[PDB]
Amino acid sequence: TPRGFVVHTAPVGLADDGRDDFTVLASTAPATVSAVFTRSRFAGPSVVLCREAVADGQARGVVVLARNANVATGLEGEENAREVREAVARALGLPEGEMLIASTGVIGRQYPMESIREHLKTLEWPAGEGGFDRAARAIMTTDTRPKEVRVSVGGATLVGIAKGVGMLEPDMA
Amino acid sequence: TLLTFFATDARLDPAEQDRLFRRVMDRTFNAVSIDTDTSTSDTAVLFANGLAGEVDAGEFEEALHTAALALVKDIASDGEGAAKLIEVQVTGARDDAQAKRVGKTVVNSPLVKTAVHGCDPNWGRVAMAIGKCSDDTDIDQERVTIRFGEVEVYPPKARGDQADDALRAAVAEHLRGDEVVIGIDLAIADGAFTVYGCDLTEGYVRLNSEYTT
Incomplete structure (x- = not known):
């Protein structure tokens, strides 16, 4: 519902079920951003990069990958996270620091880069807006159902989507 | 892993927003626990473009609270x-x-x-x-x-x-x-x-x- 939001979703073989598992949520318009994150000693590289992206309180989107958390995947894992984050920004004609990355799923498992590579090469701006439903499904792992919520305030709309029901007691800052 | 992302066309003061986002986040997503196992990867973001004009930060903080909270119970039921x-x-x-x-x-x-x-x-x-x-x-x-x-x-x-x-x-x-x-x-x-x-x-x-x- 809110203006200038578009949603990209697709299967990338994070699990082998052909389920949408790769989301890009972006804004056709510059967005001020507010965000908090885990403070884990095994913070994944997706997190480090986000903390960096939001440092200027200025960000236009997030690419989220579900069914692989990309954590404790050493230098390579850090390299794929740079790679996925940069290539999403780039496919969308956006500056790097204006795009964040978030990844959920198993620990200690390398991305299916071969597969993500090929999808990226097709990635482009979804026409029309909204689709937060697709995004709420596409991020979901041990969740039995999607989680969406929408509110009107003073002529503007605010939507939210969430996920997680295990490995869950956030302590974010 | 908790992931949640919120998206609005409301214009807000950037300062007041972060501050607002933090207070709602501590009452909701920072207030829920299934197994105590604070993941390696939690991430809670809100995107705010001005596309619909200036909302009362107050009305907004309320709106968000109502939203995060619905998602939080939704987390705990699930x-x-x-x-x-x-x-x-x-x-x-x-x-x-x-x-x-x-x-x-x-x-x-x-x-x-x-x-x-x-x-x-x-x-x-x-x-x-x-x-x-x-x-x-x-x-x-x-x-x-x-x-x-x-x-x-x-x-x-x-x-x-x-x-x-x-x-x-x-x-x-x-x-x-x-x-x-x-x-x-x-x-x-x-x-x-x-x-x-x-x-x-x-x-x-x-x-x-x-x-x-």
Whole structure:
């Protein structure tokens, strides 16, 4: 519902079920951003990069990958996270620091880069807006159902989507 | 892993927004616990473009609170394996931060969590739970109250077991709903805080045993 939001979703073989598992949520318009994150000693590289992206309180989107958390995947894992984050920004004609990355799923498992590579090469701006439903499904792992919520305030709309029901007691800052 | 992202066309002051986002985040997503296992990857973001013009930061903070909170209960109802949502409401703490510390200890107690699952009014476990906060030496068991739904099981007024027998039965009734409420007063100062979680089912064990997640 809110203006200038578009949603990209697709299967990338994070699990082998052909389920949408790769989301890009972006804004056709510059967005001020507010965000908090885990403070884990095994913070994944997706997190480090986000903390960096939001440092200027200025960000236009997030690419989220579900069914692989990309954590404790050493230098390579850090390299794929740079790679996925940069290539999403780039496919969308956006500056790097204006795009964040978030990844959920198993620990200690390398991305299916071969597969993500090929999808990226097709990635482009979804026409029309909204689709937060697709995004709420596409991020979901041990969740039995999607989680969406929408509110009107003073002529503007605010939507939210969430996920997680295990490995869950956030302590974010 | 918790992931949640919020998107609005509201124009807001960037400063007031971060500040606003933090206060809602601490009351909601920072107030929920399924297994205590704070992931490696949590991420909560809000995107705000000005596309619809200037909203009252106040109206917005309310709106967001209402939103994150719906998603939070939604998280706890869906807790891996869960049959029941546990809402632990703490008041009378020395400060808010103790309230939540006491809240969290309660909802994170396996013994509490299983008692709520089995519908066994084993409130004494909620006593053990509070007791666990052994560094808070101003928690006085003489002054502390406990309730499940609208029934106070502690402290014992009078003598014997008949007060506890009836009303433990009343607790067993309230437990049968899909949402259990634990109320706890400390009688110290005005610290208040509600935390959320869920019963610990056997589904929880099967899921996290038989699958790799």
